[PDB]
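Hi support team,

I'm filing this because I wasn't sure whether my run with protoporphyrin IX containing FE finished correctly. The job status page said complete, but I'd like someone to confirm that the output block is well-formed before I use it downstream. Pasting the exact inputs I used:
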Amino acid sequence: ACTKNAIAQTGFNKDKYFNGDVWYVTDYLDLEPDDVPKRYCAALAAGTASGKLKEALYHYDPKTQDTFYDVSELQVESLGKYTANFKKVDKNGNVKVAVTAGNYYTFTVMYADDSSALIHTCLHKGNKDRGDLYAVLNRNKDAAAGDKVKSAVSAATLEFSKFISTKENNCAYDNDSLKSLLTK
Ligand code: HEM
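And here is everything the job wrote out:
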């Protein structure tokens, strides 16, 4: 189960974060052992569509090739802290698994600037016991983590040396699909 109440960035700028552009995961930290594969790739687009906060997600396992997309409408708990009911879609936005109660993730933006972010997410899905996940994001694919986000990791009392890099996986990203999905 998840164990952390992540604190959102003071003065979080929602319009900048939810601007329709893509964020690449560059490094991640799962608190539960073996909760996720050690080699993985992920990215998301966050934006507004007709006034609603939306995210589109992309997951890619660079070994098994397992690939999936999700779209969510986000509901506000407080500034920088959201609850998202996800639907699994193909890259075109065609629904493969409908939204269902109990299938949701929370999402807290702990730090963000115009090129980087630190987030926490707690995934709830079916009958699987899942733990907290932290992710360092960048606007640029595979960018090395800068001093601002690394300092934020420290300030959150986390050790960046424990984060797993995604940058050395042979991963490709369909940023056009992610952007398009925001409306789906
Ligand atoms: C590199 C970082 C990440 C890794 C390694 C990772 C890993 C995984 C894995 C292995 C699954 C499939 C679990 C299963 O169904 O058995 C999964 C599902 C999921 N993850 Fe992630 N994830 C990452 C980042 C994220 C982020 C940043 C978010 C939210 C913004 C997120 C949200 C979700 C959601 C909503 C599902 C279920 C989707 C569905 O079943 O339709 N993940 N993740």
